[PDB]
Amino acid sequence: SMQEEDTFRELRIFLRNVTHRLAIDKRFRVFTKPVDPDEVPDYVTVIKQPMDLSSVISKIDLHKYLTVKDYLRDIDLICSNALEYNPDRDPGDRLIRHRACALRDTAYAIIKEELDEDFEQLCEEIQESR
């Protein structure tokens, strides 16, 4: 229906806003674009499901997220990928892991403060009906 289409449109608007706020944070610059294979050729080898904030925006616009829960799975993926690819004790690796966890924590905190639980439940019930 139109009302359900309106619901998913509000979801996309909400998700773009959250993603924009993550993307403009200087700590998260490394997560804003896909990894350049010329600079890092072994990334595609090690990480089977690459994810970044530009790709999240593309997925929002392609209507790939019908719930905030599905969006958070991609946020979690950005974080888990970073933990996986940068596991060493070296400061470079520890910095990116800390930033990855901060990105995840920040996304969840924004959602906790600004997502109405009943809006998410409506999205989930529309999703499950299809």
Ligand SMILES: Cc1cc2cccc(NCCN(C)C)c2[nH]c1=O
């Ligand atoms: C998303 C991402 C981008 C990136 C770019 C350059 C270099 C690294 N890794 C640091 C090198 N260490 C893994 C040894 C990178 N690690 C990442 O996790």
